[model samples]
Target: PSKVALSYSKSLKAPETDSLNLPVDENGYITIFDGETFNGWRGYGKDRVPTKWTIEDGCIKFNGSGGGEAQDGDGGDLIFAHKFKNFELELEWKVAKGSNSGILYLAQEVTSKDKDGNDVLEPIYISAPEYQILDNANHPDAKLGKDNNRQSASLYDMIPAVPQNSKPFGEWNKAKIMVYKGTVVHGQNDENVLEYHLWTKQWTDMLQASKFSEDKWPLAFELLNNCGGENHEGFIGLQDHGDDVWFRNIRVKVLD
Candidate 1:
């Protein structure tokens, strides 16, 4: 009987780790960010981490320039070097007062035509879904998108996270993002706040109502409409939205 019970227990899925604790490699999860270094991470389209991002106090810190998207000489989106699919990602983040940043998943790097018709790398958001991070109390974006969809932990611009419960800037907030079989869930501060299914009529309707609509952003609409492409896998990323943001305890548990 003991042997049978042991086998049954082994077949059960592992419980999630405590929000404040770091995740280990057990149960098929792997630690993506080491507190002391930027191993397994780099600029989205570059070979090395941008100069503006540095390790400080056990967190990946992006020093702000206030210059906005892709304006800084060495700053851009920071992404894990590896691709992931069907995974659970958890991290802790804090921002300066009124600052804005984001966490992105299943991101693909793509090239688009510039205003001059020259080929250039499109920003990460064009192909990835963002988990909005911002100073909800102070950032103007919190009040911009319809129904608070631009606020923290929302699927940025597409869906709003109900029960908005992000901590104030300068305070750490725990976040969890899980994606499995075209379904995604977003958790903020220990609460499962929002969920959505990809590749569905609802998703298409949401995109049509968002800033990425085909009439507004054709490239983004095309890319995001069929996110992750044929393989349905891509890199995880952190945004450099010209604001001071810090992230740590970043890890992922790959699910089958």
Candidate 2:
């Protein structure tokens, strides 16, 4: 479909309930979020959902504590229980004014030491490429990254999403992410705003220039440079950026 037509379709919202509850279909489409349950979803590197996340109004809503990232007993990132490769993921999201969050893909769980010297799971962004979610008008991060890369639907700190069609906070926006082979695309409000190919010299160059540069984040630079590693697949994740964010109509179609 034309970008214009697709953008116009963003006004249409998905139904509130899943009468069939068909999580997987014959055509390989999977309803990752059924609108009413947290089945097949959990915290990153943890076995259960965190206390701060709940299902409300048919959306996965995260109640913000304003305490910052990965608050113990609050929440960290949320991820689907399975791994995916060469798939298309579709979802709708809305954020509270001045909020921040992200959709992470091809994420691997890694362990690192905390300040107390105890082994802890690293944040999902450390191992995945983030499709940034933010309130472009009010969040300070919107103005911080080079070329608005921190704004909604951009590859966080790496590539800016052109056309930047995110809706205002409190309004719903459609997001589509496609990863096929080594190519990735980020679509916001029905328009594809950015595209990048992974595991190439261009990818390496982009990483070196971003916050995850080898000099700044050696482990992340290495992990993300060859994202998904030898398996070429990893978990899909939703970030907990200590903001009120809602996500729904989450589904994926496997290409492999």
Candidate 3:
């Protein structure tokens, strides 16, 4: 695993794939957000106080404060200090019209909950695959979540992102995602999103337009103790979904 050469100031070449670039195995990559530090990441939802959120200039902001009054206390759901399943990720965000954020992957930091319904590895600490960032002209569930493809560039309600170029809320918006060879791509500011495919045939036609079936349940995974499944590589997140979002040039380019 040696031949690692990448230079630009003069040109060293040999490592190239496509958009935003990738292919850098052997520990030469894997940094979901290291523009400054979150050290990777941790601290799951609710219980309130202590962690407020910061990082200024390099962006990571969000100190609207933790959840509690009834819910949303620790509703931030931050994860990723290390645990990757596959690669290729990139970032940049800004929110404030209605506000809501997301960018999870492979996500499996769980506790327990396996009767099968698995509204996403519920009751756990985390459960990946979400590249959703919201605002949708004021998130009232983004206008009932029907067209605009569930609002912002979605993969949330199973797949949605059509002509909603998101830019009016605060500004700074650049997005990217790729799960590799199996085919999964979501790019925002760049616009190259036609539709995504997962288990073939447009993920069964996006699971028949809404409701991926298999028993739906979204109770925040019932308090996970720690669990994860999709891991060839994992970790890459940021979703303090309480509003006031603003991330920075977070980067990732690992692939294998």
Candidate 4:
């Protein structure tokens, strides 16, 4: 299928009922992405998401539409405008063959100077923890990390999921992440694949051993180091990875 022809029209408004009726509404759950527009998301440092990202076929899709680095170049990542803490987020996503993308949280924005001296927000991976998304069967990254930590549903590079049961490429997979009081759990396709305790010795040790610990990823190490102590709240994001990616039914609920 020609992805170009599948482009969506931004003229339509999201429906009223799209944000209600979650089984956990009484618990403060609310829909974030209405699957029709970038109403709740934005570009790295802009008020609106880049043109390349759009509402298409009921999903927030990145098909490389925007110009500049985002058009011919990779569109980059998208972050939710709102920050979160102690919450549970659920969403469904899929990727094209051999593609790569990620769901990230606890991302602190880092500002740096571009060649023109303009401040640019560094990539989200520089400061956030990611829930990896990939064409596990075809993407090269799925086979690179130690103990499958880079595979779908794993906690990026710090932890690996057991059972590794992500659905094949082109098929939607459900993912849920919960962070409450310090305990974090990652669920994929209805299974609890990974779990961790934040701000603990284990987390610090993991960070120290991961690539984030290197000086090359200064922002990542600092952010993770900060998160190891008292800063636990940050933004949620989706990686572009310059490939076909689709996301829908993104919702979250505050945890008491």
For every model shown, what is its TM-score relative to the native structure?
0.87, 0.87, 0.30, 0.82
Q: lDDT per residue, candidate 4, 1-256, as tens digits? A: 1111111112111212222222334546667776666765666555557776878878998774323123355366777755677889999999888777789887666677889998776667767788988888987788898998889999987788787888999999999999898788999998999999876778767877888874556666777766622557767788777777899988788778
Off by over 4 Å in 4: 1-27, 64-74, 113-118, 214-216, 228-231
- 1 or 4, greater by lDDT: 1
Model 3 per-residue lDDT tens digits across residues 1-256 = 3333322111111122222222344645433444566543545432222265666887877665423111254345555444444456667788877777777765544444558855332422234557778777777767765555556668666567765687877888888787775566888888855455444555544444434322333333311111133323444656666666788766566567
- 130, model 3: CA deviation in Å? 9.9
Give Cα distance to truth, residue 130, candidate 1, Å: 0.3
Candidate 1 Cα RMSD after full superposition onto the native fold (Å): 8.5
- Candidate 4 is scored at a TM of 0.82
In angstroms, the error of model 2 at 97 is: 0.9
Q: Compose the digit string of candidate 1's lDDT tens values, residues 77-115.
A: 888766777899999999999888999998887877779
**lDDT of every predicted structure (CA atoms):** 0.82, 0.82, 0.55, 0.73
Please count the clashing residue pairs in each candidate, in the order shown.
0, 0, 23, 1
Better of 1 and 3 by TM-score: 1
